[PDB]
Design a protein around this ligand. Structure first.
Ligand SMILES: O=C(O)CCCCCNC(=O)Cc1cc([N+](=O)O)c(O)c([N+](=O)O)c1
Length: 228
């Protein structure tokens, strides 16, 4: 029942130093929450910025930095650029599941690849198998996360799979809905969703992880529509 709270929106001007924050409802944010920061640009295009409090994802501009300040986590953008206008999400680990904050809409007044199909349209009552084909890294060395986003709702972690044995961990919401597997020779991770209803219409993302390093690279998101 943990809730992660972020500022809903902030407006900045090019060149300013701005700090976004991420609070935990049950206590101070700690290193053991392994906070990650990700950026969403149009059209539902996610990139990883920071993992595990303060590790910047290689290739991300150095103006982005993460830290813990007092009882919460913080993403500092040191000299905002016009292209930084985006939605910024944090996520915290709570013992056995990830919880996403609601995102901060930032207005600015100015090799690793995970490949997912853009969309699928499936009838109610059917099943769907969503694919996430990877390249640019040694696939068995990393887990694959899946994340859901229903219209007007927050990001929801579905679960992860470790390709060394295929061991899964699901969130409460998806523990009897999603089935994760992989095909290592084709470098592809799969998520089946069963017993589809209109409530399953959503964008579904794959995102890379591993112990201590989560959500650094994302697929584009497959928009699933469940309709006859
Ligand atoms: O590198 C080292 O040993 C040092 C780092 C050790 C601790 C890093 N913790 C995580 O990364 C959090 C986490 C642990 C899991 N677990 O323990 O199984 C998961 O299953 C899981 N998930 O997303 O489901 C997430």
């Amino acid at each position: 029942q943990a809730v992660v709270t972020q500022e809903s929106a902030l407006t900045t001007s090019p060149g300013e130093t701005v700090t976004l924050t991420c609070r935990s409802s049950t206590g101070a944010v700690t290193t053991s929450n392994y906070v990650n920061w990700v950026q969403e640009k149009p059209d539902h295009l996610f990139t990883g910025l920071v993992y595990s409090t303060n590790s910047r994802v290689p290739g991300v501009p150095a103006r982005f930095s993460g830290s813990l300040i007092g009882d919460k986590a913080a993403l500092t953008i040191t000299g905002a650029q016009a292209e930084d206008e985006a939605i910024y999400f944090c996520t915290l680990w709570y013992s056995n599941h990830w919880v996403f904050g609601g995102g901060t809409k930032l207005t600015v007044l100015g090799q690793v690849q995970l490949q997912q199909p853009g969309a699928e349209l499936v009838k109610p009552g059917a099943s769907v198998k969503l694919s996430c084909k990877t390249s640019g890294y040694t696939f068995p060395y990393y887990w694959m996360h899946w994340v859901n986003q229903r219209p007007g709702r927050g990001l929801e972690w579905i679960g992860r799979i470790d390709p060394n044995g295929g061991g899964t961990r699901y969130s409460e919401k998806f523990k009897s809905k999603a089935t994760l597997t992989v095909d290592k020779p084709s470098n592809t991770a799969y998520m089946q969703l069963s017993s589809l209803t209109s409530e399953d219409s959503a964008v579904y993302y794959c995102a890379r992880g591993k112990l201590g390093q989560h959500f650094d690279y994302w697929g584009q998101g497959t928009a699933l529509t469940v309709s006859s």
